[model samples]
Target chain A: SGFRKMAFPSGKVEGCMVQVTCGTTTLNGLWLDDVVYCPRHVICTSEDMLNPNYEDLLIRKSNHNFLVQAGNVQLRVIGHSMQNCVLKLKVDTANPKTPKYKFVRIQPGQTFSVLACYNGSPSGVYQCAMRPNFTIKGSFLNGSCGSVGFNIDYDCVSFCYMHHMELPTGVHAGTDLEGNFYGPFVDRQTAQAAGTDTTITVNVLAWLYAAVINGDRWFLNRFTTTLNDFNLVAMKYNYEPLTQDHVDILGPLSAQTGIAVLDMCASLKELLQNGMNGRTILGSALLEDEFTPFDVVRQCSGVT
Target chain B: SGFRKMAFPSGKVEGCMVQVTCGTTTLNGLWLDDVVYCPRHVICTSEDMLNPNYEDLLIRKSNHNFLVQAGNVQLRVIGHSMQNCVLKLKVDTANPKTPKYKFVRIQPGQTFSVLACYNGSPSGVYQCAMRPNFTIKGSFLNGSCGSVGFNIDYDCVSFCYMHHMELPTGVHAGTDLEGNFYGPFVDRQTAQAAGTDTTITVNVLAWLYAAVINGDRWFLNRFTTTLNDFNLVAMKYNYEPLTQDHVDILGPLSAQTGIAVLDMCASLKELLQNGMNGRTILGSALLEDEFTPFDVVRQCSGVT
Candidate 1:
């Protein structure tokens, strides 16, 4: 089978030669059977960011002494002993035996995610023991049945996940993949500090959320174009947060946020379905809410 | 490989036999290669509900002369030209070429589903031509950003779906799997009819939703145990939808309803976050909403 190869530096290892082909096989995405033919442990961050000097980088799956530098990336190290800062997790939803939920996998390199339910198993009733002296518990139920589950699908996540939620609701500033720095600016900034593309989308919705929450309506026309402009950004920039930098900040919550735009439409739909809420801050938007999409799509531009 | 076999009646077909092993392969879950040697274009209902009398049922992949009896099942006839009554749709979200979005798949025998987006493709703009003289369209965006998408995720579904939504908001009666009939009862009926298990969970949340929507304070007490009871039912009966009988009613809206309970938690959370809604029916539940889960779980029983 064809494969990518990494060449070792001269005299860097006893088996140093032209370029050694790493084993083609992969289990759990690790080349488990091969050995690193290098002088020192070969290291790299993201697998795509592999340093060529170390021909043995991820060359083998076992005992490779590698650590992932960031929380966003999924593939950890090839070997062992070196620990990663992020507590990786994988719930074995498909496992049929051995106390399924109790076997909460806590490892060094994997990324974390919790589903509402998996493989027909109810959300488990057990506490997750977070290493590094932390403990967390997850909810056994999807938060809101028939409504919005929101982030209550699980009660708590790992420290890395908690760090993600602990992010201050500010315009976080950071550089994008293209090395351009975006603001944690005063007026308006991305909700995620790591400066991801979805940050813009998140920012727009966050503003809409605040506006609606405040019942201030869209500042431009006082709830007139709020729904229209709100729909505009979401409709246009559908690429949501998955960039590694973005993941580092929001982690698993990126998925939670993905449905935010939908939430607005539905919540408003509910608001509409139940008749006008002249009592709440969202009050009666009978005037603003009932516009047609044919009328709304053309009004997409110039709101920016 | 060992496999299940189907037998044709002695004189049913020219090649009538005791039984024949289905080909040990599946592509799109259809045994397309094998030919059926039975008479009358042998047919059956759901694969799981195969009738033994027609032993030649589902013995081939292509040219299936069978039509699935209901909208809920996935597999249809193994032979050709037996168009299922339901318009089956599958969005080729992962297609790399061939104008992916324009290639909205419409066929018979399959179920229908639209993702927020597929394989990173933005929701498409084209309209779907519904067969049997119908047409439908889908949204190009997730409805909200960083909020609830609700069912606004899609603008419209098929006529069957529209029929599902058009269901009257009164009690509709249907039997359950165990041959028990549940009501579309007056005081409180399931949100979905065809009678499934989650209907109870749906019923409880529906009442809570109505109570909160009306701000009637749970009627058990003025706003005291409403949030507690709301959380109780959701925390319990964790199963959402997916009974064949149930799906025939709501069709695809089951997923949309799955999150309703979560929506209540979040909408209320949003309500609490923005301080009291003295203006709304859910005006001031700060006293009611702030109780601990520990306190709420104990109050689960008598509310029944």
Candidate 2:
């Protein structure tokens, strides 16, 4: 067996002082047995062979017992009492349960909305609760406990939605993402329920709504005609289906006829169907109502 | 009978004038057979001369027939056109074989709307040429027909309504005439639906609608909450609950604790119980998803 060790010259122990050289002698040691020194051989003790930093080590086990024993060896034991304490993490919330919601109770001919909502259970009842303590905008309405029942299709539209009644009397206009005009709706005319002429303006609030369904910019033209307008401001202009030439010639013809034209076209509504009251000549000519769009459009082009 | 001529100051000669002093008299004239007069009455050959406009001197032989020859008789007639008009007065438009109006079909929704319009029939529907149109806001929307069979009890909050869905979203906020707030809605909560996001402005519109329905100006500070700085201006102010705390504060903290509060208050809705979400927060703090109106009032009171 061969081993190497050395000391500095100050102590008179040189680098080669502890070196041992072996030609052919093989060295081995058993777990319980100590190595014996042969003639002219230098032997190492367990104390000198063991490394105190055992991060990665080869250990010779003496027995299978789990007991660890050491004689005259320094050892460090570590742990903490704080680790014994139990820790719990959780989230308790005001609205913990998934609110089952769908608009349920609605005023006859009034609109209903929801705030702070999830896709409530597929077919759950949602109540349009009494007014809130605060003016809040969140979705997930109360369940049908308000004054209605479950099974309100939260995703569906209903007759109770009188949302855009303030819009001009005619066509419904919808826009696509590209701002292209979609329709001059005709079906959503003639309010069946009478109101006090309620008009509300919710300034552009986007994120606050649980959902803003079917809202688009455009106003209806008039009764029976759902002609959509590009800009609502345009209503103030000569948007009447009556003609400018007619107004210029006929307006002065008679005060009665002039008043009739103004009354009939008061709200910028399109007169798709003509009637005695709605019919009037622009001037000397019998102009009548907006029986057709092309002719009316052409007539009204220069009115303004 | 006696006759006399009178002349006006303008040198105009009046027709023959005769006054009999209210006494009955027999008019007689010499007659020559078959002699006719144009400018004056002629002679009758058989018995005597008769002035058809004034006196008849002929004697009738039979009760069934009269053979007296009268002269200078004129007939007058006056009226309007008698063809292709609805039957009316003495005009002879009575062609029994004329074609009658044939109603090919009738719209159920419009029929329901015109008859018994509840919240279910908020908008009226009319059909023309196989297409259905809905009327709201005093205008007609083409292809915007309201669902034909909507039941306030059954379809009040359901999204299936065709016409009502066409209404903007925010229109469904605040206390309705029935004293129910349709929502403290946030925008576009129902991602699956197309128009959910557009409802953000419907609340303010709803207040106006409420006023219109009741014909009252009830939307004052007492009913509104102001939002100073937020993306959602539509929900800036909210309608306060009729019975509730005047002020309450909630933040991220309440989101964790208020879930149970909503559950406790979940039993008050009566008119809107059929809804899925309306019933969930019918009587609890969860009833309103928007911030507290009381808190909003307190906070915004200092603001403009």
Best by TM-score: 1
Deviation from truth (RMSD, Å), model 2:
42.2
Candidate 1 local lDDT, A38-137, one digit each (tens): 1121232334222233334434434323322111222233433222211121211211211111112332111222211111111111111121112111
Residues B210-242, candidate 1: write the lDDT tens digits.
333222433222122244544453345332322
Model 2, which residues run further than 4 Å from truth?
Answer: A1-261, A264-304, B1-244, B249-304
TM-score (C-alpha) between model 1 and the true structure: 0.24
lDDT of each candidate versus the true structure: 0.22, 0.18
**Where does the lowest 10-residue lDDT sum fall in candidate 2 chain B?**
B6-15
Q: How does chain A of candidate 1 score by TM-score against the true chain A?
A: 0.22
Tell me the deviation in Å of residue B42 in model 2: 79
- Each candidate's fnat: 0.00, 0.00
Mark the regions of model 1 whose C-alpha exceeds 4 Å error after superposition: A1-78, A81-84, A87-304, B1-78, B81-304
Candidate 1 docking classification: incorrect
What TM-scores do the predictions have? 0.24, 0.15
